[model samples]
Target: TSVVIVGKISFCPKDVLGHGAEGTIVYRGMFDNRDVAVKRILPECFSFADREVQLLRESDEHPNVIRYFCTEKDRQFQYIAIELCAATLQEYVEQKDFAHLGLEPITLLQQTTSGLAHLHSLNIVHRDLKPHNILISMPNAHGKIKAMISDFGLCKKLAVGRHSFSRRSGVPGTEGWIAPEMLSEDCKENPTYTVDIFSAGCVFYYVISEGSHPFGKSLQRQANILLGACSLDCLHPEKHEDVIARELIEKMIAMDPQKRPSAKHVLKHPFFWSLEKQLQFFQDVSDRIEKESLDGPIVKQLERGGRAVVKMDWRENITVPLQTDLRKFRTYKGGSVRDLLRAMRNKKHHYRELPAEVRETLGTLPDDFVCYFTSRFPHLLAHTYRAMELCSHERLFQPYYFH
Candidate 1:
């Protein structure tokens, strides 16, 4: 259990994946002939490192969970080792442009349920199963996609008798995916597996349908009310006219957990009929996903202090056309620091000009909390000021730090 803390796993800086309430996720190498994920838990903000380590170690043997290679802990630091993942479900969906990815939602659902079913068998509930937590390993040269369920920090292992309904409670899940009953003050004293099923459905909707929220309408509306609506416009009923996918999505996301499907029942549903090839292909994909991180496409950055430095180039075939219209706000227009910051400040109105996905991602902000908050990050001034203005007036949080 006692291991020396190796220095932080550093790589040539590139955009990180799955960074939110958790922490930044980057792919790094191990001394062994394999690559692993180094989830550098943010010690200052979200205090879930210990919990994640516990769950990860507990379910380390489960194929559905990320493989745990080793643990490194020293007086002031702790590091977790997991099998590297290709990209998150969020990134995968967005990259496909929603409408025309030659993949099927049901196949994805089957693979996901296969993983969830394995977890439930162990009596561990993944309280948060959003698409963001599901990472896809890159396909091999053969084009196979492998998926893995990650971020077990929020996972809860239940006692035998305690697994019954009413044993767990509280509003403990992500929005849009949380079941209605779980949100009620009445059920604040009870919890069930259905909470996860609801979340699974939300992810199902997101992956298949152009990455749109299942509970459409708008974020400004009551979240639960919108979730209750359970619209499936993202589903292609014409091609997948099979009501199985729709019915499962609609019913599983029922406002009440009592009506939701169990992961077991979900696995047996006709919606998952094509799982045989999908699961097999996924395993192949998982192998390739890990291999690429260790030995492919990495460009050397520098060698200093006796270490051979390198950066991984994960972005390929990714293209974003430049939008020249001044009326439309564009992301990442490079310039001198001061001018970019001033331009963003002058074009606050252009927030309205963002693409639907970008606008939705930023969603609603808390009043002029922008002005109050932007002033706090003086360090990001270079990115904020130098950005070019398309056409609008007023500055916003266009800091290029993570743009």
Candidate 2:
């Protein structure tokens, strides 16, 4: 019997949710009546999608990995159907109001490292490990949320007998979140699984620090990192009472790639020892999480509060503030060009929905506020509107893009 490629199902063009370089678009579409994320790539990058389909199918059994349903190709492009997730880990953490939502950084790290460990077990290196590629599901039967490692477009298979792989091109990831070795001038050094370890450390700091980059947020500062000019003082976990967590981040992001511990080793670290009892509580919830939509006031309240809402009926009657500065509207930090664009698309209207009293209080903002934000964070607003419509219909949770 032959496994047929699923090419017959047609995706509605109106459902396009996100677009990436070289013409890749994510869509909210249905297959056999179930909602799914359709990643359509132009022929130029179809080869990457082909490899992604293969790897996803191979590791589909892992609950922490994104599920690959099937693949479809037409004359102009290839479509890959993946399990629809509620939001990226970045969005989920932001919605939780950083640690103010009561969600522990160790808890998030535990799930993420578990996924990375599974990938390592398969001899795969998620060369581009960052918050954007990590997704979260709604609560499952056990009322437990699960984190999944996704977007294998840059995934690499470790060469047999060799511990690292090399890329002739420059570093293959978002600058601030990338590893130091990949940024160095020396390209001959084969990249290792430790590269992911380093990036994971940056992500750990990002989540725990409420989205601050461990490295400074400028190109000069980023270049300085290659020269060992950054420090854990920026992360400041000491303020949070989690001294061990900060130390763990320092070890993971050590300048020398060799010093970074394997994902499995990090999982066994003493920092997570305290989570043992708490981890048991979520075990019975299964892999699927809740299906709540991202646009509801509940989500808005959570984003403002920075904590996960366990009680379904919980709501906050808080007043919207009058914030006129465009700089104040920026949520994502030190992200790739694509990530920045997607953030603007999802949040551009943040100013438009202000209450009349708040708008009056805001008075007049700078004349170029709209123009500066639009030009600096470029993405067609129409597409965002379509995505918002789809999300409102419950056809999707959050807009997803390959970055």
Candidate 3:
């Protein structure tokens, strides 16, 4: 027959999209006039997929979770209809438009983590959370695309209130993306949903940094995962987001799964803070230090270190470069952290006050401008956020910052 129909969804037999290493064929198909990636699972690989549909049915509702349309069966295969995406994260990395996606890695990270959080809510662990399993959805009406988490083939649902699952149930995760505890024999930690956290942590590192693995080169990544060695140098801490990224990922892929944080908590890390919120942070600390007494503890403590906060008036040092391209936004007089934040706050509010040469090189305000300050002074945000750590109790500060 020219047409192959599984349940209600139908596609031509020859419209192949790709083949899965896990014994399935994907075809470009349509139903309800919507495009879907039709996955035809072979009978031979059907031995352990009893709950695949059950997982899909429950997970299809989230915007970040890939939509599952429907399912049907034929003589030799089980067919499932899934939301179509432009490409997998793996494929998008090599494409041309990824250059624009550079500044928005935060969006990708947040979306992926949101999806993972939702799945873990249902007690479902996506044992495979790699680039291929992470898809980029078609752009919405607003021209924004989302990172969708798909492929529940290796998913496992932990019995209610049971956090850990033994490897005895079934093999878990792809080689390089596998959590450290999964490889242990004698230690046998009875891995939990955190296994996915470890895997996503690695994927997290991969996206933020240039597509480098935390565990080193491809062939060696699995070996390194087993041996407890990795090279996380790729995400340089010079960038504000990277500093927070490094902090989270380091804790996430901990050799001890028991020590890793919950997925819900992971969402609150400072890396996800909006640019404006980050600006507000710097402004608040500057305001705090400005009004304090000369002998005030916070200011006194910062200068005492002479490294993390300020070292011998870096404003002049920074001015040496700003003098050339960036015309004086105005004379920046103070040498304290106050100067840095006030300048940042002022520059953000009124970039037109500066020279075209500087603004041009700085890209647009709040983007390149924020990147310039944060990357130049990596420790500033960290130290500032800590100085006012007491304010962490406030609702505004609660979701915005964590070490």
Candidate 4:
């Protein structure tokens, strides 16, 4: 008769986790002996919490979405029990110990996109997506942590059969993370799912570069983002991985929302390609180029000093020193697509023929192999992949298609 009622028992939770924007208090509490975050919602937030609960119920089956246990009520407030998370992504990144946390941005962003894809599949849009809404799960037995999408308070479900939604109240999304179209008065009634894609694009650059915002510093970002001028200058232009990362972010944050890729399309981007996978792709290209006659399109483009699909500096990007002790070094220095692919082929399995000291000087595996070429020629992988894709599709779309 003196306190809260959870599962027909009365008790007060003492540990304060935090407060929600909707005026709810989250506390570390026990539900059936299981540790959980108990969010006590005020009367005004009853329906909002109910909507969030139902949304959670539908989306919680996935590992990337937080798990919900049950909801309880006292005369004063409604309490929701959700799986306890270690910290918000924002909090985790801002910690001093984060420098040595050994986290991989590629892995984290890959999982985040997977979760966002699931949400979009269910016709739910997280209108307020930002670093604050992304939660970091507790470490597993293997010490692996995953990024989870949370805080569905501002969530909205799209109309059946419609791709966009109308915003009547005001602009949605966090201050700096808001997509360009979200600020346009005329676009209020026609904003598509790409809005989140744009926000996610900025987040990707932010996460990969560590703390630098792509649009620039804190206060000026909104303006820069509006102007569609993001500074990926922090990511080195000469680094292959950073080159791909910049291109992907450039597309994701395109001022023309039509250029933004869907979450599903985003999952297939080359930014997430692993070293082994990248090598495999190169080997496949090597196979094709080897068999093609002088009349081949891939070869013809290379000989013609290719435009957007291929770079003229492909041969020059590979330095003389890296080719010093190689068997095919002379052949690789020639100016042909066949020469370039064969040089890559020699390292497909790796530079097994090189001296122990030579291999040692190269660096680690996979990266050692890829970086040897990419360090000198950053956009080679990107240009090759795009050219091959275009070749396969036969001019389906130069870049943007089907808005």
Candidate 5:
């Protein structure tokens, strides 16, 4: 059914599509019979919404970035409508078992770089370009899988005097994928595009080497080593010496922003030489995605998938209670605001498990409210809360567990 948009948000789904720092995301019915993902952000919750709208509008030109169809607004609520993707790069990657990916390495790398380069060309740093941000569109008539970048919620465009993404003014991006500089105040001098490339390389390394970090679980290590390796042009694919292709990824991931390959340079990489080649790669990816998604994983161990498994960041079995009621809230000893701020300060990740009370509370929350929460704080997106003890520093308006 079509969403009848009057002056207020009249219709929203009981189920949430996802959530993030910006707000919750939910499917807000069809528009002209096409599916749309509606991002509902609380104007009061953020200092400004214009910047995010500007970023989405600016990045709308890229084929990989999610399309901004239109928007809806009332006095208190703001809704953004965009074309929806079937699944995320994280979900797709996990389904294919990472190591047994159907798409060839060169092809996958080419597409990711293509998206990254385009965003960089716009001077916009996709502060959160992890697997979750990358999405797969429906296969074309030829059954080719096209990819798109989703969620510009934390994107920042760098101009000569623009605000730097590295500043610690507020929270941004997934911890593991986030650049170290972004955590510091000196972020302006350190163009985040370099960090994007580094992340892309980390992804490439995982894609090619069957789910292995390029530097052997050193993501937590300082960026210098990766930077050092990329600067010297030493880090590259281990088995295949697709010289030109490998060189493109290495350069795209270079630490020195000046030295990093431009989007134009990356597009010219021998990896994606022809449209037909790119199309074929999509077909391969589509087939793989379909097979994996339909049949699920090959083994029970591999059946449940996503970025967490590959990154080895998966945590399980924790629960938390809702604090809406004084009686219930008092039973659980939640930490102080200082503690929550400290957790955020240290970049700790946690998820809240649902106690029955919290689960019931979630059911009663407005669809847009639940959507806003889930979309911004989706599992494996950023930090999640497990039990109150484990995630003492986290703020929970809704109940759920973190990994």
Candidate 6:
């Protein structure tokens, strides 16, 4: 059964996928016998539809970015055909449970950054970067999981020689996740990639803390965020124990717009080092498998309980081990002071430079760690006390309850 919105492109609109600002509604559909996501926009928003189509075409070449098909226009509305994905990052995380999302938080972050890196390289700032805009693709036969960045309705292309842009009216992003600079009249005057960086940090915090925003709960998040009152201060020590992750978030969400590193720079941090190595290793393995099994779809014979199964795709068998091996790679366990010392010793140091308060905190490490820091890496002392300070700040800023 097919319903036509225009000529040559029709879909059996199955379900309403989502609704975005400006009455843009996405639906699950079957187009050309393949499942696809269709976005329907009111004729009143044809200009926005055109902008989104242009950006998607520019950025869709990336594997971690959403793929766009063609668009159809009718008298009442315009329709866009997008590659259907399994779920948004928010839905995936919530339904699958963060700990069991079939991918590590680092991997998720890596893909997201990879997508943003490509966009930034093309001079596009995803004006709205949030978990909802990032979609998780259904695992392929190889058990490979992919997170692709989507939703370009608010995307803006930067003009050459300019690092930022401004809007004549209110800002264009979700309240709680938007950067502080995006909210201030003076700061919002010049929006840049950092605005997305701040939102991405909030996303990282959400992924790691299993859905808690840095600004706390949603009811008052917008107000708290705008007033510069919220902090990573509220994260639980046990839940937020990933020190490297914490430091990255700190820098990403720094109050000063100039302080947040660009997407490319963030991808270079030490936290991603192990993940990068594993990804390359798997790619090598995948390449080998694809090469060896290239003969008209590698097939195999199998038997179970006296029944013979013939012509089974052998790639399925190979993918499991490749994926399992990748997942088996050990996570970085915030190594000892000596490990940190060695990292700092690098010619092109990957660790974040010490912010004053953080440096002071490092000076308080007990005994050996303390003496080592105080004597040798005194410079790093100030970079070290993030957790202690965060905890203290939480106590100081305890929420006020009223009767």
Local distance difference test values of all predictions, in order: 0.52, 0.60, 0.75, 0.73, 0.50, 0.62
- In candidate 4, what are the lDDT values of residues 1-403, reduced to their tens digit? 3345577323456677889875778887677776678888888888878878877879878888778888887777888888888877677656635456554657778888889989999998887777777888888899788988888877888878988887657668788898888776455347778888998898887777766777888988988877877778777876788888887888888988898889877887778877767766667677767777778677665445443222453544444555565534555544554566677786555677766766665656676776776666676777676666534543332221112
Query: What tens-digit string does per-residue lDDT give for candidate 6 at 1-403?
Result: 3465465456656577878775777777656666778888887888867877877877999999998877888788888888889878898667665545544666988899889989988989888899988988877898777889997877888888988787647768887888877766555357788888988988988877677888878898877777767566544333213544666788888778898878876775544644333223222222323333212221110011101111132212222332233234332112222223222232012124534443343332233223422233322222323211232224221221001
Residue 359 CA error for candidate 1 (Å)?
Answer: 53
TM-score per prediction, in order, is: 0.58, 0.62, 0.79, 0.85, 0.55, 0.66
Best prediction by lDDT: 3
Q: lDDT of model 2 at residue 316? A: 21
- Sorted on lDDT, best first, the list reads 3, 4, 6, 2, 1, 5
RMSD of each: 24.3, 20.1, 4.9, 4.3, 24.3, 20.1
Q: List candidate 6 segments past 4 Å from native.
A: 99-103, 185-189, 233-241, 275-403
Candidate 3 per-residue lDDT over residues 342-368, each given as its tens digit: 677666656797666656655675556
The reply for model 1, stretches above 4 Å from the true place, is 1-27, 42-51, 97-101, 164-171, 217-222, 225-227, 235-242, 274-403
In model 4, which residue pairs have backbone atoms overlapping below 3 Å?
none
Against the true structure, candidate 3 has what lDDT?
A: 0.75
Identify the superior model by lDDT, candidate 1 or candidate 6: 6
At residue 185, give the lDDT of candidate 3: 62
Worst 10 residues of 5 by lDDT: 380-389
Where in model 4 is the C-alpha error above 4 Å? 1-3, 8-12, 96-99, 293-333, 336-338, 347-365, 391-403
* Residue 317, candidate 5: alpha-carbon lDDT: 14
Better lDDT candidate (2, 5): 2
Tell me how many clashing residue pairs each candidate has: 21, 12, 0, 0, 29, 7
Where model 3 places Cα greater than 4 Å from the true spot, the runs are 42-50, 140-143, 237-241, 284-306, 312-372, 385-393
Which structure among the candidates has the greatest TM-score?
A: 4
lDDT of 6 at 146: 85
